[PDB]
Amino acid sequence: DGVGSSSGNWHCDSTWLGDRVITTSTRTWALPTYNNHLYKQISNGTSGGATNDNTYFGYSTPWGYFDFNRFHCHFSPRDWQRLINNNWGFRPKRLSFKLFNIQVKEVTQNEGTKTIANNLTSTIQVFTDSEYQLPYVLGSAHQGCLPPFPADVFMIPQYGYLTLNNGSQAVGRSSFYCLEYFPSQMLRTGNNFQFTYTFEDVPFHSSYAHSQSLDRLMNPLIDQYLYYLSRTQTTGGTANTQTLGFSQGGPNTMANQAKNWLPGPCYRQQRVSTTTGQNNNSNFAWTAGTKYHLNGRNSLANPGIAMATHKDDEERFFPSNGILIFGKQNAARDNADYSDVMLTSEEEIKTTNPVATEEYGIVADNLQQQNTAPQIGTVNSQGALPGMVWQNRDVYLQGPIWAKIPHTDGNFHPSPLMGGFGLKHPPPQILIKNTPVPADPPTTFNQSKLNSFITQYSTGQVSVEIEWELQKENSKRWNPEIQYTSNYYKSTSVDFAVNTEGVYSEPRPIGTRYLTRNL
Amino acid sequence: DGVGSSSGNWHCDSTWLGDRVITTSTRTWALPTYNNHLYKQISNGTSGGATNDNTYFGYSTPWGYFDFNRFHCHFSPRDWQRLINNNWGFRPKRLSFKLFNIQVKEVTQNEGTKTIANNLTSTIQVFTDSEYQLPYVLGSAHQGCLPPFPADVFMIPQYGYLTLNNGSQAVGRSSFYCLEYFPSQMLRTGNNFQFTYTFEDVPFHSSYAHSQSLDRLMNPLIDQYLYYLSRTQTTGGTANTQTLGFSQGGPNTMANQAKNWLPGPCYRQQRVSTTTGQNNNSNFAWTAGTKYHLNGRNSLANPGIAMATHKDDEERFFPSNGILIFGKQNAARDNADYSDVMLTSEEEIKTTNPVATEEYGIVADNLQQQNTAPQIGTVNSQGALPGMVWQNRDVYLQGPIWAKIPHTDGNFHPSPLMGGFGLKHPPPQILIKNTPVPADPPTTFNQSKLNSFITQYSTGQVSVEIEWELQKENSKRWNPEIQYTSNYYKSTSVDFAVNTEGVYSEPRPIGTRYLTRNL
Amino acid sequence: DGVGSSSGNWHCDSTWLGDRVITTSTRTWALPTYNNHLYKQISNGTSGGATNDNTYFGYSTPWGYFDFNRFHCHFSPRDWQRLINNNWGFRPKRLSFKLFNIQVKEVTQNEGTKTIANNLTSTIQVFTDSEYQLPYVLGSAHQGCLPPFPADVFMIPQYGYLTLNNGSQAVGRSSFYCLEYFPSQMLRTGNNFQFTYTFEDVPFHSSYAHSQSLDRLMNPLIDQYLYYLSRTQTTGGTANTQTLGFSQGGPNTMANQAKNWLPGPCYRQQRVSTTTGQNNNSNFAWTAGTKYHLNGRNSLANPGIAMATHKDDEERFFPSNGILIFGKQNAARDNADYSDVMLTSEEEIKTTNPVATEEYGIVADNLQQQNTAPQIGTVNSQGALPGMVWQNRDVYLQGPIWAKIPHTDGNFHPSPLMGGFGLKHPPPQILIKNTPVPADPPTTFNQSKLNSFITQYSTGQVSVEIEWELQKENSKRWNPEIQYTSNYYKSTSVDFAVNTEGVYSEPRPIGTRYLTRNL
Ligand code: NA
Ligand code: NA
Ligand code: NA
């Protein structure tokens, strides 16, 4: 381990071995000094115009962190295509992480003149929250992950966290965490860091779409032996009185047939069209938003439980806050136009999951008698019911991979709503920080903590290797399947490539459900 | 294996060994040529009067299939009685299936004169969908199962299936399956077929009724140490003002007592009386029906989640679509009269499950203050809640046995709603078909597929043996239990026997819950 | 491997061992940052004046590459002379490549004042395209190879490639390649790199000229026993009528003699004289150029198939685009004068290959009869014919060595037309790049890829050792052979040496065919 010796090589590749695929990606990173080496209490109350739904109390820290919770951090577009076009499923098995070729640079600023040089003896500090003692900030769809394109140099995100709050104030249970309290490895140029991790057992992601629907599992050609109430009143003319008539469900009465299952849970969202002219002329994104109520404040149930984005022929419709939406390259942070973002679609699950913008179904609302007509009620919120079956939200090339399951007494189907794998012991948080280097101190002793430091930052490479287990497709479907494919005809540029300006871009969201499977 | 040698014997019997009972039944079957040896696209759209709730797209195939998913296919009435009167539970363990004494006959039709003869060299084809690659059509309560009566010769059902559809059209994900794509055993008279299967671990069916109710589990003689808000206002006369009074639940206030559990989930159905005069005079079977909404179309939640058919003393009431209904011998397929069908009753579960035609309970609907009286809301749809306990629908001698659990990311309490055992790997589908035998072809070559075949059908016997594990009763109940019993006094015929015409009939539905068990 | 230790020595030499000769050359190189560390889509359509024949779509990359596909990269002039004056042939067997004594320097630019210093902790990245997954850019006669003169420091070429295009647009099949996707070795000053490679079996290059011609292989002294049609009409005066006369080819009728072979294939090029006055006064270089037509665009067949540059006594003539042409030291890039370039000559193959500017031969063009005189057609394009024999283009001291045979279903005599050895698995491409080193990043996190980098470049030495197998000459020719020789009389400077200015130059092209061989 010396100044003149590399401490690691560039490992970027993918190998397919059978029921496994191993991805490996390396990137060059840059880490500045955050918070001026300080920890700062940050808060936001209800003063000014800040609403109560957005209050918070927490801290910003001088630390940065590595994040690769995004599929494109590991799969190239072509690899993603190889995965989704041929496998009914897949899942993470184990990973290796490495930090190397570290270099700490210090910048001198005198008379407009700026010079940067190495500080051969400075160190960075690194450690993993292997015992999950820090607030788990990963799994919240934050920016700062390794770039999709291998040639892009990225900046390391700053670590910050939240605790309990009451307005802009802290409460008795509010917790303060000092990351310097943890043992951490100190590396100088020449030193490297690495660790291994094994994923817990988790189900394969459903990278397939159903080629059958819950309400169409019977034999088209045979009647049931079971009967259903088919008539409640006579029909012979005008002397119509009450009676009781029963019939057997059959090919023409599939909606009446007795069935064994029920569609998945529902939490109805407001519908909105991509054809603005068809929408009400008001600003309802928030006022008509589907939300949950937690201790006084409201949050969008975004994207909320997995529901079909729209029913047959209505591609223009989508749940106001019930789908993942990515931005196109350079889309504005605020009020970006529809043509600057990319809406995803969980259309593939219409097959088992209720459509996100409609009722779950209908229930009786009273007791009918001869003097009281029967009444019905529309169900727009339907929790788990015995016999329900459903699918989870799909995952995307540019979407999240996993999330830490909250440590609670209970929960229900812990599949992270934004999509992905829910893990009790997810990949550990990897914290990194440039060690503060005092600028000359006074010549006579003083109690005060130093606050004058040499200006510096660090850079180096990072590698992440993940082994994935594949669940091969075993279909007897005779006719060809749907497959993700590149466009055929000429185009100004190549999809999933760089610009004349060297800018890489992801033209569209790529899901995972192309192959089909029976129910 | 020769023309003159039987390839199997008649095995029909039952043996009880302790915590096991083995059923064995053989039947004679007949298989015609279906679809003229062809596969046909079948569809039903929204034209004519066909409603959208009944649209579909699928295929009919030239294949038949064996089905024995009906308890009476294995248990004789007496055996069913032996089972339900002495065991708290039971479940399937393993099975053996066999096809033998196969004979293919061809029929010649010339001048009104019809003759049938053997075609000693023809074959039938058989195979099991052991990898569940075909749409699983069993578990939809279709007719065509082996007959309850051993002497009845039955016809084999034709196999057909459904895929996705949009009206009467197919969509991109629609799948087409060719059963000739699968390896299959070909048998001539003299050949036989057989296979073995083992049921996955599954809970014992609850063949018992609770002799206690969820709201009556306390000691009748002792007060709780816990208190409840008992008074909100003074009582001394007319100067009545707000106050706070607390009391301890006790023998006379069992409805107020603190309890540990909640009744099972609810999805309220409209009530209907068997005394037509008490019903509203309108045709509400469908309009007031309890349904679920899936991709644009509605289906009856039939019979839906398990709920008590009626409360105390109301045997005349039942959920419009919340109970299994069987027909009596020869009941019409359409608009059969009440006296021609047999309604089942889940009355035994009033003990833990909400009554199907009433509310789950009551919740607060606002925040009361001195100027605002408290308001309440009736709950008619209640999904899973921590602390709930419930029972499943009972199974019946003439009811279904199992159903394949849909292949989905999630589900909740996968007990098939029509009743029975939910299995991830249920008994495989057994497909059978008579091999097409060309009638003379032209004398000079022609591209076209032959469409002229010898007319023939097949017949033979089929055996199914299933081993069931019994959960013996261990009750300390002092007084006698309720038991299913034959009627004592004279009758025109014998229940569960044949007619003067040789017709077998099942006079009533026979449940499984006679013995009792504490909560 | 340290900052103060050399990681390799200077190996420049040649050793002759018998049927082998091992060349070894080392050079000092310099590598700048290319494309500002970016990948850029580059294109050229049909707008402005750009013709369709020159359209293209591809990418420029931040990578450089090593190239030594030029004989003078390995053989000194004297060594080349030792080779060509004594061997009938030779070929590459194996090679060793090495990168060492690497130094990365960073340049600071403040107030017109420029300073360069070491960046002891920076790295370069290197890797070989050992599986031929990148577009093979070598073998296209590009500049950037190691210099002929060992003392010259050279600049490393930038890597770029082309894919399919339609005008200036890309198409569906267009491919984008990221070199950071490949595993690569990272070296700091002190680290080194190296690899070994073995050439596939390939024929010896024909470093000889034939001392016999295809049409002169018979015995000068003996008649053939075979006859040929020698007369078609009588000769006795004016009563001349048709007849049939046959004769035996002999010493005076060698042009009529029956022969076993045919001259090599032909693709006639337009002739041009070095005496401008003898040329047509028009600009026909392109309009009269010999070309091939591929998907809408035309390319010069340059130099095209191997054909003799000129026939006897016409050294002044040459195919407009059918010979290799090198420039003299400092010849302009555009419109260089005839006296500034050096034309090569494949004159040695007149012996078997058609002359490049004349017909292949003559064929019948009709069916002659007594009323129809026979007609003939001149053949200017003649593809492979049974019995043909030919020679390939010679190779030159300053010419290319090998080319990768295109991966296609078929091909014919895959000897690269520009000259050299055609290999299915040629020496791998060696890619190199300076790793980007971020200049200080912002102090608060930002999504954007860094675009501010420290200015730097690298330098070091490179070694290439190749082992060549020689095919010794075994001639019984009595009289001396032609040999390449230095001029005898006084001259201003020494051929193949430096200037008074220190500039090395190659005064002339040196072929390989001096010794002779019978057919
Ligand atoms: Na694409
Ligand atoms: Na009876
Ligand atoms: Na010379």
C-alpha span between B147 and B72 (Å, rounded): 8
- Kindly give the pairing relationship between strand C266-267 and strand C381-382: antiparallel
Q: Is B406 exposed, middle or buried (0-12, 13-18, 19+ CB in 10 A)?
A: buried
CA distances from B78 to A469, B72, B438, C147, C228 (A): 52, 11, 48, 102, 111
> Which one-letter DSSP state was computed for residue B3?
T
Question: What part of B 321-340 touches A (C-beta under 8 Å)?
Answer: 321, 324-327, 331, 333-338, 340
Residue/partner pairs of C296-301 with CB below 8 Å, 24 or more apart: C296/C52, C297/C52, C297/C53, C297/C54, C297/C55, C298/C53, C299/C53, C301/C267, C301/C269
Q: What is the DSSP string of C75-104?
A: --HHHHHHHHTTEEEEEEEEEEEEEEEEEE
Please list, in sequence order, all residues whose beta carbon lies within 8 angstroms of the beta carbon of residue A390, skipping any fewer than 6 positions away.
Answer: A263, A264, A265, A306, A349, A352, A353, B408, B409, B410, B411
| Helix, strand, coil percent content, chain C, rounded in steps of 5 | 5, 35, 60
Instruction: Say whether A422 sits in a helix, a strand or coil.
Output: strand
Pairwise CB contact (< 8 Å): A355 & B295: yes
Q: How remote is the CA of residue A27 from the centroid of ligand 2, in Å?
A: 78
Quick one: residue C338, left, alpha or beta (phi over 0 = left, psi -120 to 50 = alpha)? alpha
Distance (angstroms) between ligand 2 centre and the Cα of B487 equals: 6
Distance between CA A44 and CA A57 in Å, rounded? 7
Q: Is some CB atom of chain A closer than 8 A to the CB atom of C447? A: yes
C488 CA to middle of ligand 3, Å? 9
Residue pointed to by tokens 């003649």: C382
Taking CA C428 as the corner, what is the angle to CA C427 and CA C432, rounded to the nearest 5 degrees? 130
Q: Is C275 exposed, middle or buried (0-12, 13-18, 19+ CB in 10 A)?
A: exposed
Q: What is the torsional sign of CA C397, C398, C402, C407?
A: negative
Half-sphere exposure of B130 (CA within 13 A, CB side): 11
Contact at 8 Å (CB) between A265 and A355? Answer: no
Distance from CA of C150 to the nearest CA of A (A): 28
Q: What is the resolution of this structure in A?
A: 2.6
Q: What is the DSSP string of B59-88?
A: EEEEEEEE---SGGGT--HHHHHHHHTTEE
Range 28-47 of C in CB contact (< 8 A) with A: 35-43
How many other C-beta atoms can be found within 10 angstroms of the C-beta atom of residue A166? 14
Rounded Cα–Cα distance for residues B176 and A478 (Å): 6
- Whether residue A416 is preceded by a cis peptide bond, meaning omega within 30 degrees of 0, is no
Sign of the Cα torsion A451, A456, A457, A458 reads negative
Give chain A's largest Cα–Cα span: 111
User: In this structure, are strands A56-66 and A185-187 parallel, antiparallel, or unpaired?
Assistant: unpaired
Which among B310, B312, B308 has a CA at the least distance from the CA of B349?
B308
Does B50 reach chain A within 8 Å, measured CB to CB? yes
Instruction: With beta carbons less than 8 A apart as the criterion, state whether C271 and C318 touch.
Output: yes
CA distances from C13 to A325, C75, C89, C494 (A): 64, 9, 21, 21
| The pair of three-digit structure tokens given for residue C291, joined into one six-digit string | 């070309």
3-state secondary structure string, B228-294? EEEEEECCCCCCCCEEEEEEECCCCCCCCCCCCCEECCEECCCEEECCHHHCCCCCCCCCCCCEEEE
Question: Distance of CA B288 to CAs A517, B275, C261, Å?
Answer: 35, 18, 98
- Closest-CA residue of C relative to A493 is C170
Q: Which neighbouring-strand residues pair with A29?
A: A154, A460
Residue type, A398: Q
Residues placed in the known binding site of B for AMP = 415, 422
Q: Is residue A40 exposed (0-12), middle (13-18) or buried (19+ Cβ within 10 Å)?
A: middle
Pairwise CA distance, residues A464 & A26, whole Å: 7
Within 8 A by CB and 6+ apart from B9, the residues are none
Determine, for residues B281 and A223 on separate chains, whether the beta-carbon distance falls below 8 Å.
Answer: no
Q: A468 CA distance to ligand 1 centroid (A)?
A: 23
Instruction: Report in angstroms the alpha-carbon separations of C239 from C233, C234, C235, C374.
Output: 10, 8, 8, 21
Element (H, E) at C113: strand C113-118
CA gap A284, B234 in Å, rounded:
47
Does residue A303 have a cis bond before it (omega within 30 degrees)? yes
The two tokens of residue C164 are 């399919």
Ligand 1 centroid – CA A500 distance (Å): 18
Any residues with CB less than 8 A from the CB of B328 and at least 6 apart, and which? B340, B341, B342, B505, B507
Please say whether the beta carbons of B328 and A233 come within 8 A.
Answer: no
Question: Which alpha helices (DSSP H) does A259-376 contain, by range?
Answer: none
CB A46 within 8 A of CB C161: no
Token pair listed for B457: 């059908």
Mutate to test the interface with C, among A459, A463, A489 (most CBs of C within 10 A): A459
Q: Assign A90 to helix, strand or coil.
A: strand
3-state secondary structure at position C72:
helix
The length of chain C in residues reads 519
The reply to whether residue B294 touches residue A213, judged by beta carbons under 8 angstroms, is yes
Check: CB of residue C483 under 8 Å from CB of residue C513.
Answer: no
CB proximity list for B49: less than 8 A, separation 6 or greater: none
First to last CA, chain C: 57
Give the bridge partners for A117, in sequence order.
Answer: A106
> What ranges make up the beta strands (E) of C184-259?
185-187, 193-198, 209-210, 227-233, 242-248
* Contact indicator for C32, C457 with CB cutoff of 8 Å: yes
Q: What is the DSSP string of B102-128?
A: EEEEEEEEETTEEEEEE-TT--EEEEE
Q: Quick one: tokens of B297?
A: 């179309």
Which position has the token pair 């990418």?
C59
* C-beta atoms of A228 and B302 within 8 A: yes
Question: Cβ of C443 under 8 Å from any chain A Cβ?
Answer: yes
Task: Using the structure block, give the residue that is written with the tokens 């072809």.
Answer: B441
Report in angstroms the alpha-carbon separations of C270 from A379, C279, C284, C309: 86, 11, 9, 11
Does the domain spanning C1-519 belong to CATH 2.170.30.10?
yes
C478 touches chain A (CB under 8 A): no
Q: Give the dihedral sign, CA B163/B165/B168/B169.
A: negative
Any idea which ligand is nearest the CA of B81? 2
For residue A60, list its beta bridge partners: A40, A160
Q: Are A467 and A13 in contact (CB under 8 A)?
A: no
Distances (CA, A) of A518 to A211, A216, A348, B67, B132: 5, 11, 13, 20, 9
Structure tokens at B231: 């008074």
Nearest 5°: CA angle at A66, between A71 and A332? Answer: 65
Using the structure block, give the residue that is written with the tokens 């009856």: B300
In contact, B434 and A406? CB cutoff 8 Å: no
Cis peptide before A442 (omega within 30 of 0): no
Q: Let me know: does C263 contact C214? Beta carbons within 8 Å.
A: yes
Instruction: Tell me how far apart the alpha carbons of residues C511 and C398 are, in angstroms, rounded to a whole number.
Output: 9
Q: CB distance A115–C120 less than 8 Å? A: no
The neighbouring-strand residues paired with C194 are C98
Map residue A314 onto helix, strand or coil: coil
Chain C CB within 8 Å of residue A460 CB = no
> Is residue B462 within 8 Å of B67, Cβ to Cβ?
no
Q: How far is A349 from chain B (nearest CA, A)?
A: 9
- State the number of CA atoms in the 13 A half-sphere of B305 facing the CB: 31
* A363 vs B: CB within 8 A: yes
Q: Tokens 């895929």 label which residue?
A: B163
Q: Do residues A323 and A283 lie in contact, with contact meaning Cβ atoms separated by under 8 Å?
A: no
Look at residues C262, C275, C295 and name the one whose alpha carbon lies nearest to residue C387. Answer: C262
- For chain C, positions 55-84, list CB contacts with chain A under 8 A: 59, 62
DSSP A473-515: ------SPPP------S-BSS-TTSB-TTS-B---S---S--S
The encoded tokens of residue A440 equal: 């000359």
Strands (E), B295-440: 297-300, 317-319, 325-327, 341-343, 361-364, 376-379, 381-382, 388-389, 402-404, 410-411, 421-423, 430-434
Of C391, C7, C356, residue with least CA distance to C208: C391
Please name every residue paired with B389 in a beta bridge, in sequence order, or none if there are none.
Answer: B263
CB atoms within 10 A of CB C305: 22
Q: Quote the CA–CA distance of A267 and A420 in Å, as a whole number.
A: 20
Measured from the alpha carbon of residue A77, the closest ligand is 1
∠ at Cα A285 (A281, A286), nearest 5°? 125
Q: Which chains touch C (3 or more CB pairs under 8 A)?
A: A
The span from the CA of A421 to the CA of B165, in Å, is 31
Q: Residue B178 CB: number of other CB atoms within 10 A?
A: 13
The whole-angstrom distance between A500's CA and the closest CA on chain C is 4
Q: Which of B166, B265, B280 comes nearest A312 by C-beta?
A: B166
Question: Amino acid identity, residue A460?
Answer: G
CA torsion sign for A134, A135, A136, A137 is negative
The minimal CB distance from A459 to the residues C36, C38, C438 is found for C438
Å from CA of B483 to ligand 2 middle: 12
Which residues 184-223 in chain A show a CB within 8 A of chain B?
Answer: 203, 206, 209-223
Rounded to 5 degrees, φ, ψ at A488 are -90, -45
Helix (H) or strand (E) holding B462: strand B456-472
CA–CA separation, A407 and A426 (whole Å):
12
* DSSP type of residue C504: B
Compute the distance from residue B486 Cα to the ligand 2 centre, in Å: 4
Contacts for B5-11 with beta carbons within 8 Å, 24 or more apart? B5/B190, B6/B100, B6/B101, B7/B100, B7/B101, B7/B102, B7/B190, B7/B191, B7/B192, B8/B98, B8/B100, B8/B101, B8/B192, B8/B461, B8/B463, B10/B461, B11/B463, B11/B465
| Cα-to-centroid distance, A490 and ligand 1 (Å) | 12
Q: How far is the CA of B505 from the centre of ligand 2 (A)?
A: 11
Q: Is C123 on the interface with A (CB under 8 A)?
A: yes
Closest CA to A440 of A429, A449, A450: A450
User: CA dist A299 to A304, A384, B420, C254, C446, Å?
Assistant: 11, 22, 41, 102, 26
The torsion angle over the Cα atoms of residues A328, A329, A333 and A334, rounded to 10 degrees, is -50
Instruction: Give B30's strand partners.
Output: B155, B459
Q: Which residues have C-beta within 8 Å of that of residue B144, sequence separation ≥ 6? A: A222, B65, B67, B154, B155, B156, B157
CB contact under 8 A, C189 and A30: no
Whether A157 and chain C come into contact, CB under 8 Å, resolves to: yes
Strands A124-128 and A185-187: antiparallel
- Establish if A295 touches chain C: CB-CB under 8 angstroms: no
Query: Is the minimum CB–CB distance between C439 and chain A shorter than 8 Å?
Result: yes
Question: To the nearest whole angstrom, how far is the Cα of A95 from the nearest Cα of chain C?
Answer: 18
Answer for the pair C300, C417: CB distance below 8 angstroms, yes or no.
no
The CA distance from A474 to A482, in Å, is: 15
